[PDB]
Design a protein around this ligand. Structure first.
Ligand code: CO
Ligand code: CO
Ligand code: NA
Ligand code: NA
Lengths: 170, 170
C-alpha cells in the first residue's frame, strides 16, 4: 500500500492478536508481521496465514496486572529505570488491566536480576506479574526451527538481542 | 541464519547507525532492517545497501539530552505515564547522554499535547529536548515514495501508527 508493505502487531494475547489481524485485514492490510516473546502466539499467527514473525530470544516480556493503574505504573517505572541503566531497549504498552514491558539487549545474569526485581516490585505495590520468554539460546534455536517447519518465511530479531545471543553461543 | 533472517536496528544517529550495521556485518549478519522517525537516516540505510525499513508516520521520537541521567529519567517517566494513558506504544533506549522515546498510536491532537509536555518537562528538569517526525499524512506518503525510488523493497509500519494514519486519511 501507499504507507508501506508490512504492518507490525505486538501480540500479548492469542485472542487479542487474532482480533487485531482481522481488523487490519478489513481495513485492507495485505501483510501483517506478529511480534511476541510467546512462541504459542507466533505459531497461532502462522496458523492464521501470516509468515513474518518478530522473535525475542535472549530477552523477556514482563506483564504487571492489577486494577490500580497508578500501582502498575510505579512497578513499571522502577523496571524501566533499572533496564535502561543496564543498556536494555524497552517496549511498553497498556492492554486493559495489563502493563507489558518487552526487554532486549541485556546478558543472562542481568535478565535474571530484572526478573527478580519484577517479583519484588509486584509484592511491594500489591499487583501480580507474569514473565514470558527468558529461555536459554538452545530453546530459541529449537523454537525458530519449529516456526520455519510451520511455514515462517521471514523471522526478524532485535539487533541488541541477536548480539547478546551470539556472545552467549561463543 | 539459525536465529532468524533479519536483524532490526533502531537508528537515532546516522554515524551510530553505520557503525552498528558494520559491527553486525562483521558478525555475519546478511539482512539488516533500519527503524527511524528520521527520513535522512532511512535514506542513508538504503545508500549503505539495506532495503528493509521501519517508518514512523503519525508518531514521533522525543530525545532528552543532558549530563544528569536522573533528570533525563524524571522527564522520560512523565512522558511515559502520559503516553501510556493516551494508549500509545512506546520504545525507549539510553544512547550516551541521550534518552530516546519512540511514540506511536495516538491521534494528531494528542501527539501535539505530548510534544508540548516534552518542552515543558525539559525546562523543569534543566535539560534539552529534540522532536523527530510528527509530520502530517501527506509528508509521510511523499517520504515513503522517495524511499521506494531510492530502492526500498520492504517498508514496515507499526499497526497502531497505520490505524491512526488511515483514520486521518478519511
Ligand atoms: Co520489538
Ligand atoms: Co519500533
Ligand atoms: Na528501582
Ligand atoms: Na506527567
Amino acid at each position: 500500500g501507499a504507507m508501506g508493505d508490512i504492518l507490525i502487531v505486538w501480540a500479548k494475547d492469542v485472542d487479542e492478536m487474532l482480533k487485531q489481524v482481522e481488523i487490519l485485514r478489513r481495513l485492507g492490510a495485505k501483510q501483517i508481521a506478529v511480534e511476541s516473546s510467546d512462541w504459542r502466539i507466533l505459531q497461532e499467527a502462522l496458523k492464521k496465514g501470516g509468515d513474518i514473525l518478530i522473535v525475542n530470544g535472549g530477552g523477556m516480556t514482563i506483564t504487571f496486572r492489577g486494577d490500580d493503574l497508578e500501582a502498575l505504573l510505579k512497578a513499571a517505572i522502577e523496571m524501566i529505570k533499572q533496564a535502561l541503566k543496564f543498556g536494555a531497549t524497552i517496549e511498553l504498552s497498556l492492554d486493559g488491566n495489563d502493563l507489558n514491558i518487552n526487554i532486549t539487549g541485556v546478558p543472562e545474569q542481568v535478565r535474571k536480576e530484572l526478573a527478580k526485581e519484577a517479583e519484588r516490585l509486584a509484592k511491594e505495590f500489591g499487583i501480580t506479574v507474569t514473565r514470558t520468554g527468558g529461555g536459554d539460546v538452545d530453546e530459541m534455536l529449537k523454537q525458530v526451527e519449529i516456526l520455519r517447519r510451520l511455514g515462517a518465511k521471514q523471522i526478524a530479531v532485535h539487533s541488541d538481542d541477536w548480539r547478546i545471543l551470539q556472545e552467549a553461543l561463543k
